[PDB]
Design a protein around this ligand. Structure first.
Ligand code: NI
Ligand code: NI
Lengths: 197, 197
């Protein structure tokens, strides 16, 4: 479904000021993660017993085709390391280890460890993966949000991987992430957007 | 290649005394992991900057078909989380993040995150995985060592996954593990062995 995606990716990527406006929101997060003091593009998870922790981006998209880059080293990431989008009503912390992005009707996510899609559950993505199989992801991916068609999809190392979710029109959705393990650091860079007329 | 493997697995599993004799060696380890004070079957990794840390089991096998169970929650595990076997000469620490089990001629390992086999490199396992694919492992696996035929293989949730390495006759090889990330806890239980006559 890359509609104006080739156009969006041909644009020079947005510079630092736009990247920062679209970045992790230091005031819309689990009490157990923080945006770093010298890198406002990167949050750090700082755990205590049995917690799943999330953070939303500053901008909720009701509109346009948008693309952002997530760096999460593969090393720092196992199961229930989820990348996706969420309503402003998605719980951003839980007690225990869960798929919190995708927990309820308020969030949609891709488990980078399991290659499974979450939303209320447990569907495989990319669809060409077989049973007991996972896509071997590198340190970064692209999250492609289309609030005009109402879909979510991902690119990894140049490959468009398919539409992951549909039915997202009429909502306002932010870059979100949730992690269950370790002192992870997840960078996000807004790449670009094409707004409607 | 399950030769006497069906016989080995039909035996009642070894009890706690045998499990402990075959367990992690608190004196054959990276200075940055420790065997837990109240659980001598489990090591805990306790990191500092840029380190890859290993631990070997107490018993080096020159002989027999042997099987042990590794519990490493999937959550606590990404790339360069390696399970395997090593000569008594395998480095058990490095400065930086590497595939240290499989680093040189002295060790053989399976990256649970990448589904790749290491030894000197980078081969896929199970072989039926395609390009860019990984096997989605659960919290535990079986390491099956055959020092009579000289092979290493793995079982996951009842499925024998194939011979991973060959050419291991004439050596003495220990359960080994290396981890690069987080405060992982890896349990190992020796399951059983069939010695030759
Ligand atoms: Ni921390
Ligand atoms: Ni620790």
């Amino acid at each position: 479904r890359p509609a104006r995606l080739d156009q969006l990716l041909d644009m020079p990527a947005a510079g630092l000021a736009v990247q920062l406006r679209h970045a992790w929101n230091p005031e819309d997060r689990s009490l157990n993660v923080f945006v770093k003091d010298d890198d406002r593009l990167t949050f750090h998870r700082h755990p205590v017993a049995q917690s799943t922790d999330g953070i939303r981006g500053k901008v909720g998209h009701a509109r346009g085709l948008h693309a952002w880059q997530i760096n999460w080293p593969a090393r720092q990431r196992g199961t229930h390391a989820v990348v996706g989008v969420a309503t402003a009503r998605a719980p951003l912390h839980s007690v225990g280890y869960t798929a919190l992005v995708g927990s309820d009707a308020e969030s949609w996510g891709w488990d980078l460890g399991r290659s499974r899609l979450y939303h209320d559950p447990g569907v495989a993505y990319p669809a060409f993966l077989g049973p007991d199989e996972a896509f071997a992801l590198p340190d970064s991916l692209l999250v492609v949000l289309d609030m005009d068609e109402g879909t979510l999809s991902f690119i990894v190392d140049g490959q468009y991987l398919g539409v992951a979710f549909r039915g997202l029109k009429g909502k306002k959705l932010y870059p979100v992430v949730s992690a269950v393990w370790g002192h992870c650091e997840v960078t996000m860079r807004y790449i670009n957007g094409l707004d409607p007329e």
